[PDB]
Homo-oligomer: A and B are copies of this chain.
Amino acid sequence: KSYINDKGKEVLVLWGIHHPSTSADQQSLYQNADTYVFVGSSRYSKKFKPEIAIR
């Protein structure tokens, strides 16, 4: 999904990355064992790898 800033000013965007406790909780929520998240803009680029462990 993409968004283009057309509001004539800066847009503050917030988001989250979820790190489950166990592989079972991972599969209960997303069904995929080895996942990634990517966020990218013209000045931002970052890839997120979840860290599954019991805190």
| Chain A residues packing against B (C-beta within 8 Å) | 19, 38, 40-42, 45-47, 51, 53-55
Contact = CB atoms under 8 A, between A and B. Distances in A.
Contact of A55 (B19, B45, B51): B45
Question: How many chain copies does the complex carry?
Answer: 2
Nearest to A41: B55
Q: List 9 tightest A-B contacts by C-beta distance, closest first.
A: A47-B51, A40-B55, A38-B53, A45-B55, A40-B53, A47-B53, A45-B51, A38-B51, A19-B45
A54 B2 CA distance: 11
Contacts of A47: 51, 53
Contacts of A42: 55
A22 B19 CA distance: 26
